[PDB]
């Protein structure tokens, strides 16, 4: 279950935490000791601080696996993508020979490179990635979960809540159903169908599951701060506070926890 790992940067990489990161990474590291996958996992980590050429650095001298060949060809992809002579045909180039390279390949290449561009180069990609692995067997739990969660996560925070609806509410109601009928120990769907059924207007049964599957993860801390917006439907903000207060417990990094607590803080008593 690669949630331990992919899930926990895939909510903060856009907050840009790392300490998070380290935990997941070198958890991953510790379980197999050394590999170029593992590598490449501290080379993502260590890619988000802001060089996108680490990865040259990390796993090209690593490489050769054909999960390190393809995160190593995209990778430079994106290196010179990111480079200051002008390579523009070498940029469409790599592009071409990923686009090929990714599909009609095993799915483990395609996979860690998901898990490898989660955040930077369209990360759209990662959940393209993850659906190429899974054309064979669309019923699997980790891309209809990603899909869905991320079209929930646009819907809870404030992307699309300015005009909320609820037909992509219901793409990801059946994403996460199809989720939670392939594995009960599934995270992700359980905590998005808990905020579908709060933005409805069904506080108790919302609640109700809110209380069934928190007790399940307390060291998910993306998860934990995302109770912050989808527990405001309640009518205060004091579970808020108690809720940011919590990932502060888990860890002392999320900037999330204190902008929020000053955004809610500053509402009833000006506090």
Avoid at 90 to 99: P, R, S, Y
Avoid at 220 to 226: G, K, N
């Amino acid at each position: 279950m690669a949630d331990r790992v992919l899930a926990l940067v895939h909510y903060y990489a856009r907050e840009g935490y790392f300490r998070h990161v380290q935990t997941v990474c070198n958890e991953v590291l510790k379980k197999r000791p050394g590999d170029g996958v593992l590598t490449f996992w501290r080379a993502y980590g260590l890619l988000m601080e802001g060089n996108t050429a680490d990865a040259m650095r990390d796993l090209s001298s690593i490489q050769g696996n054909s999960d390190l060949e393809l995160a190593v060809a995209a990778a430079q992809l994106l290196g010179h993508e990111s480079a200051k002579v002008p390579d523009h045909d070498a940029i469409i180039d790599l592009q071409a020979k990923l686009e090929i390279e990714e599909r009609t390949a095993s799915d483990q290449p395609c996979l860690h490179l998901a898990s490898f561009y989660l955040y930077t180069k369209s990360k759209e990609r990662a959940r393209g990635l993850v659906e190429r692995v899974l054309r064979n067997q669309p019923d699997m739990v980790p891309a209809q979960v990603l899909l869905g969660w991320i079209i929930i996560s646009q819907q809870q925070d404030d992307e699309y809540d300015m005009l909320f609806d609820e037909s992509e509410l219901d793409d990801a109601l059946s994403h996460f159903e199809q989720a939670v009928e392939h594995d009960h120990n599934d995270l992700q769907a359980l905590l998005g169908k808990a905020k579908i059924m709060e933005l409805k207007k069904q506080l108790g049964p919302c609640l109700d599951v809110l209380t069934e599957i928190n007790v399940r993860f307390g060291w998910f801390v993306p998860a934990l701060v995302e109770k912050t917006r989808m527990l405001m439907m309640l009518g205060d903000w004091e579970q808020v506070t108690e809720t940011l207060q919590r990932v502060l417990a888990a860890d002392q990094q999320n900037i999330m926890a204190q902008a929020w607590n000053c955004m809610i803080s500053l509402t009833r008593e000006g506090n």
